[PDB]
Write a protein that binds this ligand. Sequence first.
Ligand code: CL
Ligand code: CL
Ligand code: CL
Ligand code: CL
Ligand code: CL
Ligand code: CL
Ligand code: CL
Ligand code: CL
Ligand code: CL
Ligand code: CL
Ligand code: MG
Ligand code: MG
Ligand code: MG
Ligand code: MG
Lengths: 407, 407, 407, 407
Amino acid sequence: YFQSMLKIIDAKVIVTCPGRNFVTLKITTSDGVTGVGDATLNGRELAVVSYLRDHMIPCLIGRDAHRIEDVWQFFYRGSYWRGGPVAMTALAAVDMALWDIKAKLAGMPLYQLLGGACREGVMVYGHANGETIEDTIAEARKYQALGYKAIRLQSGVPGLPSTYGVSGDKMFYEPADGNLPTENVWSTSKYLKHAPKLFEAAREALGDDVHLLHDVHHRLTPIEAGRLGKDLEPYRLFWLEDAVPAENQAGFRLIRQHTTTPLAVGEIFSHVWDCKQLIEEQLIDYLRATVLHAGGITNLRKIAAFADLHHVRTGCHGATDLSPITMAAALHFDLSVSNFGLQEYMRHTPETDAVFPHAYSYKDGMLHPGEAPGLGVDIDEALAGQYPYKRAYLPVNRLEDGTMYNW
Amino acid sequence: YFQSMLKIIDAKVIVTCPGRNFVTLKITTSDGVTGVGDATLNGRELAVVSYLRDHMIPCLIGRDAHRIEDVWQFFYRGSYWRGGPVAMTALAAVDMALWDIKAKLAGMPLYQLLGGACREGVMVYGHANGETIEDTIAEARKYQALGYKAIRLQSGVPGLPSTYGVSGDKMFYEPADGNLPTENVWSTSKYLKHAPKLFEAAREALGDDVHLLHDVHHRLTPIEAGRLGKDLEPYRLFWLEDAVPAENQAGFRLIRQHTTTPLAVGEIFSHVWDCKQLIEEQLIDYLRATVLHAGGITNLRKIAAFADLHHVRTGCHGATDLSPITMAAALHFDLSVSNFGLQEYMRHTPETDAVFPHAYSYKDGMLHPGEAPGLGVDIDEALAGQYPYKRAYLPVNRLEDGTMYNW
Amino acid sequence: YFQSMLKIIDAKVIVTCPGRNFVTLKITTSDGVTGVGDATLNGRELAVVSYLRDHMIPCLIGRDAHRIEDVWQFFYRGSYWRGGPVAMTALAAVDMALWDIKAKLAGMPLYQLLGGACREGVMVYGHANGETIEDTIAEARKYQALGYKAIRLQSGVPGLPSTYGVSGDKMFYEPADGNLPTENVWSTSKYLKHAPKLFEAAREALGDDVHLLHDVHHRLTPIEAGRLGKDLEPYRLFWLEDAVPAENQAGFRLIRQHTTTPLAVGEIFSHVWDCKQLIEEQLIDYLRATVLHAGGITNLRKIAAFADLHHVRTGCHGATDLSPITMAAALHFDLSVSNFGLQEYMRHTPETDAVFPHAYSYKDGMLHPGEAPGLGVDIDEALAGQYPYKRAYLPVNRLEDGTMYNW
Amino acid sequence: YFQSMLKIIDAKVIVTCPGRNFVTLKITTSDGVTGVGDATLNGRELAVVSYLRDHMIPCLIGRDAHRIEDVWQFFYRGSYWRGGPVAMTALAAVDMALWDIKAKLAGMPLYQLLGGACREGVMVYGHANGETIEDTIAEARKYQALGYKAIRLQSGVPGLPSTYGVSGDKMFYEPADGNLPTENVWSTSKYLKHAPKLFEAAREALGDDVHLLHDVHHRLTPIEAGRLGKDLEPYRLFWLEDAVPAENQAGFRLIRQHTTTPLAVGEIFSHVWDCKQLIEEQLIDYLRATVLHAGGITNLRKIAAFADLHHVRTGCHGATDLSPITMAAALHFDLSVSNFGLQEYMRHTPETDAVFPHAYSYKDGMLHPGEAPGLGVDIDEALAGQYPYKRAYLPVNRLEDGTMYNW
Ligand SMILES: [Cl-]
Ligand SMILES: [Cl-]
Ligand SMILES: [Cl-]
Ligand SMILES: [Cl-]
Ligand SMILES: [Cl-]
Ligand SMILES: [Cl-]
Ligand SMILES: [Cl-]
Ligand SMILES: [Cl-]
Ligand SMILES: [Cl-]
Ligand SMILES: [Cl-]
Ligand SMILES: [Mg+2]
Ligand SMILES: [Mg+2]
Ligand SMILES: [Mg+2]
Ligand SMILES: [Mg+2]
């Protein structure tokens, strides 16, 4: 035998909007084996397109496709300016595509390369939202009837025109809805009094077996989050998510000091450095970082092993802005990681599913990555060409006095 | 006078199964004085048999039997690969047997060498289990009627086919029941809601004088354990045991931060290094490490003196898989240690008692080691020969999704 | 496609002594694909044989061979008594054999599953020993002439009959040489004055390009190690190894405080818990834990990712008591791990190489795992049968006054 | 068999001055077996006499002599006002006498009850003092010629009439020489410049094999001690003792930060609380606390086990004001403790040896406790009656300006 080099002979970025924007990388190797990776960065999509097309891809051509770790370190260190959502999301696409290729050459679904199956499927949660508590609870009943064992509840705040998680969309939430960003208004005090009522009513209506989750969406200070967690303790939430802006990781110390409600954070994190203190101080229970926005399978696996030393479990973000390619990768990761916690699942539109055909599927409150070789996913480029990019921004949020705040 | 060397002239390992597996070491010295030690490691018994027969014993022959500490350091450091349950359990058998010999030469029950009696007897707890709370409480009444001042309560979790501590055995629990390991299924959420009801009903039925204990059996995360401890505070438990897997000792910081329910851990520990942080940070109230699995009388005494600097008391593990030889040693230790907390007591079968005749006995919620010279215990080798080894494993435990978990 | 279960249909333990004792596990799957793992625990070999044969293997038969992580967690948690050198070495054999199988099914050398190659080969060091400094330096010149870029130097201590690393063996050191353990005598003060002279002369003779290493072999206290490190600073050692017994991990704080000589430790570690504090406090530069004694490829990879957060690099132990099966596994690991530091290499005897035929090879100061599918190694069972087990112990070490000490 | 109570039927305190003051406790049990303990508190002797005669002894009469630990806790907790040199020295006499009795009943020298021998004898150091460096070195040569492997050096400080350790006594130092306390004058600056010259010359004259020690005698601040330790590093002292007054245990942090010279402290300590921080922070290498002044065999053993977790070794104080009864006890302790470091040995006068006949003896730089049953020591009461108490105080020390300072 000889070392086999499978050269990368081509790599391209495809942009499509089958209901929302998605950016995809497709790598082709010498013998025609291809791999794809998601590179979608909601609301800043084209920055990642240029990062890939104009800078990374020309360095990728002609490389040995087998050298996954080396390529990862090459782009991570070689950019000189290190990390960040654009670079790490661009790197995630490369990593996903190379692991797709690796598993195809091995003749196995990717999870078999990552340690094999640790569970029979991946528990998911869906998204119950409504303008009132009553509407939110009605939506949650539908998720129960659908076999979901875990449900995130989000309700409008009385006295506020809008809040995170509440829209006309039922089976998903699709926030990037402005040709310019939608402006929202916020009151912490109104929200803090209301949230516990939501869960009080929800437990009464829905019973104790179902797992209930809530996303604070970055809107509190640590002492307010400690209070909110404490008020929510009687309802035993599965997690309370993104309670406070987390750049200052020590901010979670006060929360942890004042409540036993479990804490989750990090859908926006792009590297281990965004959560190292959170994890090593046991300040959170679930890490929400994803293969898409934190640098691929390669990096998320490393982070998850670190998390497992500190009683932290995975709770990967799963909003519609992560394409089916991310979902495939995420599911191979979730099926094989020992310290799995929960997987978010917002349904994509039928058009998105058709552009990104995949083997994964839902059954009885669980997703499963399927048994096809590779990620078990691809892009239909002809169909993708029928849905041109359309600019869309995430909303922003301001205080009652106009102060710029967190959405 | 001259230094007297009492040479070890023989040492052998006897395996017997008078109801369950037991491994025993018997050392003979030049003048015929013998000592025995327990070497039983539930579910991995024969690994310790080989560790002793094939490696340790040949180094033991011809040594001065008086040099207890030196022999201890010889095997502990000399194995090169240090500690671990197999090695420390093997070393525990040696240490117990040498202390048996030492006390016999001194003409005294062992506790007289270890500082003398500090109490009139050793308070014990027994094991009330039942499929329902009602059955568990009925079992606890029987223990009260038997004079037990302390009782561990364990109840089935509704919606779960089985849980730790609950079986058809009443006066004891005998888990190693599989020719292969029994698989169990687990739900933390079902358990967390149920456990407090058990103790609410138990206090109402049983009154406030009796000490009530609970064994979580490794199944929670620190934040869940903090919650469970908090929910149990109104019932004033004597201890809440093995709340979380303890390899990461800092994990107990969150528990201690959120509850005043007293904490116990460590039946599986094999050395001081498994609990040094727990003790020095005052993260626990009772250490459950035993003479059998943490390296004998010599080492447990050292650990207990360290524990006494930090308000930690002994709460030695006492399941049926510790033979009467361990029980004898444990009782000499418990009677003489100043910072004694409680001793676990599961009754052995009549056949086990006959194979291991002993002076210790139960009366009015207490055990006492007896006044015979030595440990006050021996093995009847002829009777032991009538009960051949039979393979039996401890159960395992998995989450609802198949994830490998803690039993 | 369907989930493919490749059942384990057989597993056996083979013991052989082609120059020294080796224990091997061989797993056979339904279609005849086999994998092997090393289970050798120097000086306590047969304890691991029984741990595997009598307890683990019967649980292994009929399992899905693809489920590597699940099997790992099954044995690690399921033993109930957790970790320890016997259990983790037994588990390492299972893990190595399953990864061998996985890579064979994938049609790839194992390193391709673990991230691909990160380097063109694996830098090694050899072992220069001699009774005097002059003899040690003469031996080091031979290693230089052999293309070794890194060399460990160990010299006799004047006034002491023997010391670690110094024997009649030149291309390797084979300590387990007693039908009972050889007793050695030790003086720290003689050693502390002498070691720096060794390296002073060595730099003068050998130049500055070559990497020089030293193994303290557990013999100092932290303040003595700080002094020794300081005295060695002018000679810029690659690492100073096992300076102090490391059960108390905080012991390395004083060393780190007083010297910039790089530190390595952990050939004896069996799990991440033996080094978590060392790593997270940046108290060491190289972790010496191995796939053999710390629970296989699966676990060492996890530990290495943790190490990479803290500037720690791998420096895997490589003495002759790790069989060629471990070496193969270690090399696949070393080639693919990003934070590689150095690999120890003691040459095996020709008879050992013949019993364990392998693809890895040495060239110009580097080893390379080779490109065969799997680990690239196997056992020749017929030849192995010609070399029956022969009992052999590691030496022990005592102070000048007889006190039991560290070898 | 029945529990045997050996009642204490009498206990008395004998005061004698065979060269210096000694206080002794003698306990008699029902069958005539007796035990003795030292209660000497240099310079405050009669306070301990009254503490015993007037308060403790009447509570002792009629107690079970076998209950060593219980008696210890009885006096330690029961005094209400806890610890202190008077109470703990009084308690030490009781503990020594009870352990003497216990070993006599067992028919063994005491070390056999405390774990057996860990070494062939107990390394000691003697006391070289002189007015000049030259005289000090001349005295050290005599100790070498006597087979001492370790020697404390103390020299006069030029420009100062006197300093600690320097007197007309050669084989010992006998400071309590005032019918009122002798006043001394002190200059730290003169001392700091001089001490390193002493050891520079001493190494040159005496060679590198011999262990050299120095007693700072409480006279520096931490930053000065750090400097002195640093200046002494080239001469590799065995220890630097009592560098700073140690009530503030954190004071040793600065020393440890600035020097690798090993540190010893604690001849004056009366309980574990005087050194818990020193030990747990690894701020010292040798604990100097003794069986006499820190509460007997029972308590020193506990402290030594704690010390062994932190790389601390025993370095028991051994000045002439500890009677041969303490020396006997100390030697049984030193022979049997695993983490032994060194034992101080100042020779008693011939008259003292005759009043306190004993089995221990010196040979080749070592003491050995002997093989007689018990402590191997007694008091000759008739001879003791020939040497009436004579008041004698320890010296005091003041700064050049009159400021009260530390002797
Ligand atoms: Cl493109
Ligand atoms: Cl509402
Ligand atoms: Cl046997
Ligand atoms: Cl082990
Ligand atoms: Cl019930
Ligand atoms: Cl076999
Ligand atoms: Cl030499
Ligand atoms: Cl009197
Ligand atoms: Cl006092
Ligand atoms: Cl002078
Ligand atoms: Mg969110
Ligand atoms: Mg338990
Ligand atoms: Mg080594
Ligand atoms: Mg002194």
